[PDB]
Design a protein around this ligand. Structure first.
Ligand SMILES: NC(=O)c1ccc[n+]([C@@H]2O[C@H](COP(=O)([O-])OP(=O)(O)OC[C@H]3O[C@@H](n4cnc5c(N)ncnc54)[C@H](O)[C@@H]3O)[C@@H](O)[C@H]2O)c1
Ligand SMILES: O=c1ccn([C@@H]2O[C@H](COP(=O)(O)OP(=O)(O)O[C@H]3O[C@H](CO)[C@@H](O)[C@H](O)[C@H]3O)[C@@H](O)[C@H]2O)c(=O)[nH]1
Length: 332
């Protein structure tokens, strides 16, 4: 409608990472429409915080997409929409290939028929599988070990072939462990059920869980527990705005790791929570979770070099403080 402003469709905008990206996009001057089926996102946060149009529907719904891309002009699509429970992807892969692969292919075909040729894709370091070096560079081989990682790898391949055939320009982002919350408490992680370490740590401190389980204490790690590269969701949002601007200025297709290049062990994260909250956190040492590699850390140099991305909230204390502020308000 307004004659200058770029118009962005954000699928999965009602979820964790996507809501923060929508806030940064609005605040950087883009018109945003959200497409989300609300299977895990939250309408109330879109309506009362993001204040953008919400289209409730499925990325795999071709008749809906055809109507949507005809009703309004879009310069680009950002695709956060997916299922991402790794254990359920092993249990029930059909649903994961349907949602994550078929749903993305349907979205891509509708885009091409509407002549939208700019795409930003939420991929994952689960596509690497067991790493051989660390920090992991973008050109490390990709041998995912669960169907979730395989679905994300399949889409990365589809995007490459769609570039060759149709000129689709896409930025693929391989996130590491998204964490944190909007510094002002407006938005944060709200997964039901919650499985991620940092929310579970903080809900233990809040008395909403009775203890935190540590999955494995015998890894080939300095302190015996798994190491992960936690990356603040405001920092991920910033890379999306930069990626978007990079493509509107005619960037070629690119893949970037989005991590800090620093890793924290499970123990360090529990310690970080004990200091930020000042509360006691009952800990229980349990067996390994199947398929957890000991250490996953991502090199963020390419994104820093090519997009000028500088993560602002790299310290675990920043990350855990913001999350703590959100969980006290949201999960009262
Ligand atoms: N949370 C992480 O640590 C991070 C790690 C790396 C990869 N990523 C990927 O980043 C993306 C977003 O991650 P998240 O934590 O915000 O998950 P999320 O569940 O909070 O957000 C996903 C949103 O997409 C919606 N959705 C799911 N399937 C849909 C469909 N077929 N059509 C329309 N909407 C649909 C869901 O309701 C949800 O609002 C995902 O693709 C995820 O795989 C997750
Ligand atoms: O109650 C818990 C939860 C997690 N962990 C451990 O903490 C670490 C982080 O686990 P989690 O928060 O579940 O995230 P990841 O398994 O590392 O994977 C996340 O980040 C990956 C991208 O790197 C993606 O595969 C997924 O979308 C996303 O869930 C792991 O070593 C876990 O074994 C625990 O010890 N106890």
């Amino acid at each position: 409608m307004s004659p200058g402003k770029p118009s962005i469709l954000v699928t999965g905008g009602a979820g964790y990472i996507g809501s923060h990206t929508v806030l940064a996009l609005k605040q950087a001057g883009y018109d945003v429409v959200i497409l989300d089926n609300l299977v895990y996102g939250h309408r109330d946060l879109v309506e009362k915080v993001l204040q953008v149009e919400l289209v409730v529907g499925d990325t795999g719904d071709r008749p809906l997409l055809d109507e949507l891309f005809k009703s309004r002009h879009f310069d680009a699509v950002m695709h956060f929409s997916a299922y991402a429970y790794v254990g359920e992807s092993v249990s029930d892969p059909a649903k994961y290939y349907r949602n994550n692969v078929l749903g993305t292919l349907t979205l891509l075909e509708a885009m091409l028929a509407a002549s939208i040729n700019k795409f930003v894709f939420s991929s994952t370091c689960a596509t690497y599988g067991v790493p051989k070096t660390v920090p992991i560079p973008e050109d490390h081989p990709q041998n995912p070990i669960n169907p979730y990682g395989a679905t994300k790898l399949m889409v990365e391949r589809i995007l490459a072939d769609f570039d060759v055939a149709y000129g689709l320009k896409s930025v693929r982002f391989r996130y590491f462990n998204a964490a944190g919350a909007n510094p002002d408490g407006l938005l944060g992680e709200d997964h039901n059920p919650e499985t991620h370490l940092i929310p579970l740590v903080l809900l233990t401190a809040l008395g909403k869980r009775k203890f935190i389980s540590i999955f494995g204490t015998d890894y080939p790690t300095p302190d015996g527990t798994c190491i992960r590269d936690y990356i603040h969701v405001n920092d991920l949002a910033d890379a999306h705005v930069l990626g978007l601007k990079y493509l509107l200025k005619g960037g070629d297709s690119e893949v970037f790791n989005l991590g800090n290049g620093q890793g924290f062990s499970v123990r360090e994260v529990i310690a970080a929570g004990e200091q930020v909250t000042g509360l006691p956190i009952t800990v229980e040492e349990c067996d390994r979770r199947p398929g957890d590699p000991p250490s996953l850390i991502g090199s963020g140099e390419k994104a820093r070099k090519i997009l000028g991305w500088q993560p602002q909230y790299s310290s675990i204390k920043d990350i855990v403080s913001h999350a703590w502020q959100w969980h006290q308000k949201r999960h009262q």
